[PDB]
Amino acid sequence: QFNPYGDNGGTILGIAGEDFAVLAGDTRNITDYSINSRYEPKVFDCGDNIVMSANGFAADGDALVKRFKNSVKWYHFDHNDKKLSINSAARNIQHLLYGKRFFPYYVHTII
Amino acid sequence: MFRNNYDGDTVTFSPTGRLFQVEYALEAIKQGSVTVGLRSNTHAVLVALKRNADELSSYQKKIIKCDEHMGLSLAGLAPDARVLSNYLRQQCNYSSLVFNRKLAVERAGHLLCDKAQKNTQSYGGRPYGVGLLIIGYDKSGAHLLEFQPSGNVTELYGTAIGARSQGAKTYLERTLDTFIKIDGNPDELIKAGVEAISQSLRDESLTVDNLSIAIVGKDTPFTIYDGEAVAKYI
Amino acid sequence: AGYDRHITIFSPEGRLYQVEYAFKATNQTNINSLAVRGKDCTVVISQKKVPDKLLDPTTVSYIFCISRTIGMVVNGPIPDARNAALRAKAEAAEFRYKYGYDMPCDVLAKRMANLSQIYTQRAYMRPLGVILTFVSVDEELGPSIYKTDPAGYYVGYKATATGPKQQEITTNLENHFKKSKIDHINEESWEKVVEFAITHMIDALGTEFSKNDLEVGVATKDKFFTLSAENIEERLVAIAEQD
Amino acid sequence: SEYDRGVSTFSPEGRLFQVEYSLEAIKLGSTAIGIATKEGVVLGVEKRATSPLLESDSIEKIVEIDRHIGCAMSGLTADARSMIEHARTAAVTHNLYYDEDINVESLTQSVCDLALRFGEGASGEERLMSRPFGVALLIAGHDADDGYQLFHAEPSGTFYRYNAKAIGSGSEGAQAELLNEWHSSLTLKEAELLVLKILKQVMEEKLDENNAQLSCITKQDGFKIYDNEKTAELIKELKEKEAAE
Amino acid sequence: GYDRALSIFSPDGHIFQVEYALEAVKRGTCAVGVKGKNCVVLGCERRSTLKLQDTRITPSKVSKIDSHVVLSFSGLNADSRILIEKARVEAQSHRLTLEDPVTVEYLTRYVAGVQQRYTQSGGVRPFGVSTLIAGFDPRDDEPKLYQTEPSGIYSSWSAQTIGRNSKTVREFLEKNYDRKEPPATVEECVKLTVRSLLEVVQTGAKNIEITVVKPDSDIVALSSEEINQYVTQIEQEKQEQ
Amino acid sequence: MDIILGIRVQDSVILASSKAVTRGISVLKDSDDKTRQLSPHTLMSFAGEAGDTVQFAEYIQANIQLYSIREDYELSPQAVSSFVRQELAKSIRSRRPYQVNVLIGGYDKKKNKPELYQIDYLGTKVELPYGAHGYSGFYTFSLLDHHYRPDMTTEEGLDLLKLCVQELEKRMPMDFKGVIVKIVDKDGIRQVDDFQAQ
Amino acid sequence: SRRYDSRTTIFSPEGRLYQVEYALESISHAGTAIGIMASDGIVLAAERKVTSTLLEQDTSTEKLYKLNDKIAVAVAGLTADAEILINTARIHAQNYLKTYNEDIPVEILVRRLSDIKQGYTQHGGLRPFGVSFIYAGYDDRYGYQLYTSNPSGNYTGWKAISVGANTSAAQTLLQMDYKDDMKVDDAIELALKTLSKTTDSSALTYDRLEFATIRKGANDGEVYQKIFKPQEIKDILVKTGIT
Amino acid sequence: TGYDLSNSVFSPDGRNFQVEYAVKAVENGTTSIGIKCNDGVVFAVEKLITSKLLVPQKNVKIQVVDRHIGCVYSGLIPDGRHLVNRGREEAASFKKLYKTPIPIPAFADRLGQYVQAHTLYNSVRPFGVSTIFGGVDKNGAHLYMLEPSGSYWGYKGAATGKGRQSAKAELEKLVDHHPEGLSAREAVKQAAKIIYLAHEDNKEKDFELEISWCSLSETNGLHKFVKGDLLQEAIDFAQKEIN
Amino acid sequence: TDRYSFSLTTFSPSGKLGQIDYALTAVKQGVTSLGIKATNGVVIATEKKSSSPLAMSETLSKVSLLTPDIGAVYSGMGPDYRVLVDKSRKVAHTSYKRIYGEYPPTKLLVSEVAKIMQEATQSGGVRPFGVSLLIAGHDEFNGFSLYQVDPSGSYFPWKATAIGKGSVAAKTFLEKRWNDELELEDAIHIALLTLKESVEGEFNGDTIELAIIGDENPDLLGYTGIPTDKGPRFRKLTSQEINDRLEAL
């Protein structure tokens, strides 16, 4: 029986300040009881002043983000390099995620 | 008497081996405004003369981005260009996500040729009525190309297309030895392009409302200068 | 005012000229071919005109090997014939696969005369301007020869001809068969039959041939082969004296 | 004489006449006028009814695309209903995906990428619909990036942005007049009497609040279509200033 | 000439094929819709010219689409039967997906939607029908009356007519129907509908069909006598002056 | 399951149908009408799976009504139930079948006779003098086998049906929250809002 | 020159559909067929057109057909176009029976068919049906019924109708003698008493006819449908006015 | 004539003019030549510099297929690239199936069969180019030249384009004074020569020469571009003899 | 010429589809062929013409077996008939034998074939078949049968008839010497004397192809053990059986 999922540990955190925001996340990456790398980032700037991190199953994470970033790219292409309002961003991420409602991305994402 | 039973469809060869419908297409590129492109060994440049309707309407742009390192200017039927420039944006994105390598300019030519291709060999349609000058900066430095609706993409050093484009091409053909060497300095490569374009004006002169410019190179991601910002060249 | 433009419209006298015109194209070939059957062999003849010091003749034939038993000769443009040669060349492969045994000459010709009929009634394409001549040594009829045309026709030939010279190569044979009162050439080996055609052709054309002006193939007890370049010179010699 | 019968046929001088005739179809519509002001944008149209038994509001020549975008069409009505429909879906969808309002020009954009779907034959993709739409659009809207904008959509597939523009049977004289009136510092009430004035002019029939419809859009209240009493007195209040000078 | 196809514009921006379809509506018999302020009344004429045929199941020109909406036409008979069917089904599908029964405009819109769909691609011919849709929306009391053309456009009217000699009947209506004050009685609203056809009927009430529709899904056809009871009362004041 | 009873008498059909609706632990309603009139003289009760139940009912109703304006004639009880069994019949062999059981009771103005058809989700149809779906039969069928007579008055039927319910209450574990009764006849459908108002 | 009759997809400047009109014109080339209503039955009478000495006609039929066990039709026009319909007309008829488990009402069946004929008039690449039909049947909704349908897709209900050749004549004569209640054996009378007058042949010979009728009563609480045999004809034919 | 409009149509003499006109467009493009040395081949094309603004060394007209096939054509340039991409798939799927890089002779049919096809349907335009290509397989080197009708053969060396005859007579020659395979190196040299001599039809339009070759000894089985030093030599080794 | 005879989809002002009649012309041209119904059999025959005696005519049938109780012949475009045949022998299994465990009656095969003949018509983009066949067979409940099928798709039943060039008169000859009684041997006779005048070539055993439907041949099966499976009624006479009946005129 082929099981398409895996957990690569990790923890991320996001606090919203009065006029700034942070998003942290350790760099360790694991598999069961072993180490895969002591430094493998899980927190990226996606452009338009938006940080994002998807934590859970390593691969679904990389996928979502890439998929999100390629999406910011086209939002500009179609609306005159207009800036992506972080709220407008979350709404968009929803559709991305719900896109796979029946073969879900095994991750907890945070922008 | 005196008909031409060989120009009804893109799918018919005249007795001499000519595709008239395609020819008429180019003719529509001649009827459009002018645009110029020229490059050195560190940058490429697009200079275009936007046109308009009333003193109330806006000037229709003709420079289009495609990636951080690529773009083009157009002449002719606006819509066709949209489709083309768009197909291009797609091709670059694929070559970016999948392989993670910036699409080389020559490749973008082949691609725009093979797509324009299909429309000269099948029944029912018509050929794209629009010419484009593409510019970019891959791993072989600067790059300039000139595509025509027949699927003929040629890589130049400079050029212009559009009504009266002639004069500007002439100019570029002389000042060549001069600009091909304008390296490290963008401000001069553009002043050159602007000179060359003026060789094609007859009605008015370029004002801040109808002038468009664009550059890309070594440490300059494809950016477009519009209106109030191109003033230092007028 | 265009009957003859469409492959589907009948003239007031049920003609369909497009199919008719198809034929004249089977002639601008300017190559003649006759095929005669032995008693356990079958041979087809055809001239090999190579009008250019540049074309390397090895790649200049009008007879291909459909299957390891059937051979074919075509009276038409190398492009069109090369097509047909392929379809049939494939019908063979598939037939075997779907039925357990090697496909007969007589059949393959019917798949084609049929194929070039549907080809022509549904109008899904223009009819190929060539004539196909199928030869082989069947295990239920040995000396077998069938020939299909563009109009989707076919039949058996005790030995036939095709080219810009139908009647000549033909009548010449009608008088030779009018005597022997039989329907086949008598001889124990191919070698000798071959000699019979070249022999009985120069007679109708009125010209000598060398090891390059002709081209022949033959069929044995299940083993179709094309006559060699140099080897064709052989029987040409042997029959240059027993006149 | 011979090259004007195929929507995919270039004339010897690189022209597509069927497309041109398409436009000539609009001139037959009644006039529509749009004037943009730093206060808001105005849209007005001549109704022109064949009979007194028609119900006026039956003729939707000005409609809402969304709370912040409205428009007036001219040309074939059936062809309009289809664009208006697409446009509305375009807006609402974008809203759904982004939780925001579609830029006026980005909407106008999608409306043109629709007309761009004419042509029958099969040279690759597929866009089912034979010929060009027979209608133009005056899209008045407003968004946080470029403020009050006014656009002109043509079946050709292109569009321009205007300060003021007129389409339909009268766009000839109307466009001239507007060329000599419009100025950046026009108030909303000022443009209303101007759109109203130019219609009366190059219109025809006695200008009553029955054969003339007037609307406008603002940041504050979005797209609103002026009711009959308002327009009615806006006409009197108008026709009056004509006495003196 | 340029009137050969639906996909070609004439130099002046027309599309004649669709226009010619309309020329057929004029061929059919006359229909006339007249609304009051508590009802709507449709009227027609019977092609009573060549009869030795049945009578029982003779078309009334007027058809019900739902319990609260009726439709009448003019033009290619056979063409009309399909629109009536298609609109009937849609009327039931609407209830299935929204509980609420259709609105008179939603129906008119759906119909004209179809009529227009048949003028899109070539290898299709526009319906040679023109129609009048009348009725009352669900739990509403404002009478409604719309008309649709072969081209695909729809419109609402206070009263309207289509078919041969519709120019005449229209003139009449125009100088009689008061926009400010519609017939306030079903009886007078009928009277007005009748007297209008009585200018193209060629005498007799044997050539006139009348159907009345009020609110609350209450519809009802008229009989031959009742109809004559008006031909009667209007043939009086006619020479009475 | 829900309660679905029905009985044909002298000149009419009577339908009983429990009123409660339950989602797991709670009872979201105790006044639900499991009925749905297909036409002036045809009535159809139902009971089955949560969603499937009324999506189907309405669908059927829509078809009948369509047919009725189109033909301007009213489809007969016999032909109506036939149509239903057809659909359900096709349903059972489809990606996902409706799990709905039904009772159809109409008045055949053509024969002037009341008729009651009982159909289960499998497409099994049968004409009966009285019927019930699910577990509902075991508690009643004997009482009706005992007292039912074809000559019965509408007035007598109700009295009978009352007994069956009283039994359903005394021995059934579920509390169905009472029933709602309805009568079909030459004059159409009406609701005995007095078996509830009692 | 230039005319608007090149296809069905085209309105003439006056909204005419010529192509359809021409099909409607193909009917006047068919054998006359009649249908007469009666207080207790319906009669179908036709007159075989085609003729020759050696033409089998005692077994097979050409103008009268059973669609339902309670519905019958008279054909007139394109032979092949007639069967295509007749068959589907039969399938539809059985689906109604299979769905409602009742027999399909006449008007419904006539309407379904007219609705198909309608459709071949509005879509490109299609040619309308060159047929006309006289439907005679009975259902519990409206007792006996007589209907007619043409290529344009319209249908109607007559009390006595004729289609085919010399319709003017046949139609006229009927319009005259038809008594509105007329019993069956008087309609079968009037059938020939009309067909006769509008023929050509030196004499009206039995082998040139086709009769069928629909009767019912208290007896068989249902309908009996009969299609006369060559015999019964040659007989009832004499009982009238033929030696 | 009405026989030169459609692409499928046969003229009364079995002539397909649309394909012929196709050729007229081919013998007008630039000039392309193909040399077959002992082991491997040599290709060369004439590139025309219209203006001074044309980055040199760029805008290549010779394409490699897989990694062992040379390929050059003349006529409609877009049609060019096209016919080759197909060849590129046709190649690839073949190696993916059999492992062994595609047989130069096999390859040709694939292309022919394809070009073949564009002469069958009237909804498409025949290929407007003549193609020359070849490479080294298991049976050494081969050199073909396909044309607008799909017709083709093997050559000792050939060429098409506006100026081809001179290229031919000065080509047949090399054959006569060398009957036994030319020379790897030497081929290149004499190649750059055969172009110049043929350019005298574009004389007033300065040009740029492009050569590629494929050889079991210099390339090592693979097809490579002749750039660098040997590229110069070959030019002068031709510029000298041009005097 | 009209402007209506070049479209299957087009009605002439009178009401005549065109392309059909010209198709029906290619038939009225083909070689003469006839069919006679007996009382205990049915005979179908058609002539043969050689392009040249260099060709083997004994490898191209003209009287074909569709079912072991039905055979058929033709007059018109050769090639059509060849495949129209194999499509008929199939639509005979897939449409009847495979649903009813038995072969089809005469009437229905002829109609299943006219069905395929119909398609060729109703539809632009294809041309109808230039052939007209006479199909003859017999089935238990219907006795023997004779039918004609034209491109128009229509089909009729005869007692005797002919189609082809020499038909006007051949169809006249038969008319004279036919009566309900002729035994099969008589028909086989009457046929030859009619296939007689209708020729300019010769009258040997090869240039004549005739077959007939009659009694069962318990020999022509290949097996024996099953009582009911008795044999095929269709018999294509051999070159010999012929010329013998030719001597006795």
Side-chain angles (χ1 to χ4, degrees), chain H residues 127-138:
Chain H
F127 281 82
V129 300
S130 281
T131 326
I132 295 177
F133 57 93
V136 166
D137 63 11
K138 215 130 294 184

mmCIF file of all heavy atoms in Angstrom, chain H residues 127-138:
data_model
loop_
_atom_site.group_PDB
_atom_site.id
_atom_site.type_symbol
_atom_site.label_atom_id
_atom_site.label_comp_id
_atom_site.label_asym_id
_atom_site.label_seq_id
_atom_site.Cartn_x
_atom_site.Cartn_y
_atom_site.Cartn_z
ATOM 1 N N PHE H 127 3.682 21.494 -48.330
ATOM 2 C CA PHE H 127 4.894 22.106 -47.784
ATOM 3 C C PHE H 127 5.646 22.888 -48.858
ATOM 4 O O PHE H 127 5.917 22.388 -49.958
ATOM 5 C CB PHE H 127 5.811 21.060 -47.128
ATOM 6 C CG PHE H 127 5.364 20.646 -45.752
ATOM 7 C CD1 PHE H 127 4.376 19.687 -45.579
ATOM 8 C CD2 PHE H 127 5.874 21.271 -44.627
ATOM 9 C CE1 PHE H 127 3.903 19.364 -44.297
ATOM 10 C CE2 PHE H 127 5.401 20.951 -43.345
ATOM 11 C CZ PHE H 127 4.417 20.002 -43.186
ATOM 12 N N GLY H 128 5.954 24.136 -48.530
ATOM 13 C CA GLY H 128 6.670 24.997 -49.452
ATOM 14 C C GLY H 128 8.185 24.968 -49.324
ATOM 15 O O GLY H 128 8.831 26.020 -49.320
ATOM 16 N N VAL H 129 8.765 23.779 -49.209
ATOM 17 C CA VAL H 129 10.210 23.669 -49.109
ATOM 18 C C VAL H 129 10.710 22.330 -49.610
ATOM 19 O O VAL H 129 9.974 21.329 -49.612
ATOM 20 C CB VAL H 129 10.725 23.802 -47.666
ATOM 21 C CG1 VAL H 129 10.339 25.131 -47.089
ATOM 22 C CG2 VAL H 129 10.188 22.677 -46.832
ATOM 23 N N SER H 130 11.968 22.348 -50.052
ATOM 24 C CA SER H 130 12.682 21.163 -50.504
ATOM 25 C C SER H 130 13.666 20.956 -49.372
ATOM 26 O O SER H 130 14.279 21.895 -48.878
ATOM 27 C CB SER H 130 13.436 21.410 -51.811
ATOM 28 O OG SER H 130 12.554 21.365 -52.917
ATOM 29 N N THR H 131 13.818 19.722 -48.946
ATOM 30 C CA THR H 131 14.694 19.469 -47.835
ATOM 31 C C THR H 131 15.785 18.486 -48.219
ATOM 32 O O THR H 131 15.564 17.554 -49.000
ATOM 33 C CB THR H 131 13.857 18.932 -46.645
ATOM 34 O OG1 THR H 131 12.556 19.552 -46.662
ATOM 35 C CG2 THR H 131 14.546 19.234 -45.317
ATOM 36 N N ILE H 132 16.972 18.733 -47.683
ATOM 37 C CA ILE H 132 18.131 17.882 -47.909
ATOM 38 C C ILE H 132 18.614 17.507 -46.513
ATOM 39 O O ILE H 132 18.644 18.340 -45.603
ATOM 40 C CB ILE H 132 19.264 18.622 -48.677
ATOM 41 C CG1 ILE H 132 18.785 18.981 -50.079
ATOM 42 C CG2 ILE H 132 20.499 17.742 -48.790
ATOM 43 C CD1 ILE H 132 19.771 19.766 -50.867
ATOM 44 N N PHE H 133 18.988 16.251 -46.337
ATOM 45 C CA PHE H 133 19.436 15.804 -45.036
ATOM 46 C C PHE H 133 20.140 14.458 -45.137
ATOM 47 O O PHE H 133 20.256 13.877 -46.230
ATOM 48 C CB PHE H 133 18.226 15.707 -44.120
ATOM 49 C CG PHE H 133 17.148 14.804 -44.643
ATOM 50 C CD1 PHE H 133 17.112 13.460 -44.282
ATOM 51 C CD2 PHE H 133 16.189 15.282 -45.528
ATOM 52 C CE1 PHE H 133 16.140 12.602 -44.792
ATOM 53 C CE2 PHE H 133 15.209 14.430 -46.049
ATOM 54 C CZ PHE H 133 15.189 13.085 -45.677
ATOM 55 N N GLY H 134 20.608 13.969 -43.992
ATOM 56 C CA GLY H 134 21.298 12.697 -43.953
ATOM 57 C C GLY H 134 22.101 12.564 -42.680
ATOM 58 O O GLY H 134 22.065 13.436 -41.816
ATOM 59 N N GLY H 135 22.830 11.464 -42.571
ATOM 60 C CA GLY H 135 23.640 11.227 -41.394
ATOM 61 C C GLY H 135 24.289 9.855 -41.481
ATOM 62 O O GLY H 135 24.191 9.177 -42.513
ATOM 63 N N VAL H 136 24.953 9.437 -40.410
ATOM 64 C CA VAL H 136 25.608 8.144 -40.403
ATOM 65 C C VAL H 136 24.979 7.212 -39.396
ATOM 66 O O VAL H 136 24.906 7.546 -38.209
ATOM 67 C CB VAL H 136 27.079 8.278 -40.056
ATOM 68 C CG1 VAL H 136 27.678 6.914 -39.712
ATOM 69 C CG2 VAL H 136 27.794 8.884 -41.219
ATOM 70 N N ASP H 137 24.543 6.042 -39.869
ATOM 71 C CA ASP H 137 23.928 5.036 -39.013
ATOM 72 C C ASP H 137 24.782 3.773 -38.883
ATOM 73 O O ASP H 137 25.999 3.845 -38.675
ATOM 74 C CB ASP H 137 22.510 4.690 -39.517
ATOM 75 C CG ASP H 137 22.498 4.078 -40.912
ATOM 76 O OD1 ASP H 137 23.585 3.723 -41.415
ATOM 77 O OD2 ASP H 137 21.395 3.942 -41.506
ATOM 78 N N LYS H 138 24.128 2.621 -38.993
ATOM 79 C CA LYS H 138 24.795 1.332 -38.875
ATOM 80 C C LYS H 138 25.291 0.898 -40.242
ATOM 81 O O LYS H 138 26.255 0.146 -40.349
ATOM 82 C CB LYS H 138 23.812 0.307 -38.315
ATOM 83 C CG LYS H 138 24.433 -0.733 -37.396
ATOM 84 C CD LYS H 138 23.649 -0.846 -36.074
ATOM 85 C CE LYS H 138 23.749 0.437 -35.218
ATOM 86 N NZ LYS H 138 23.056 0.297 -33.892
#
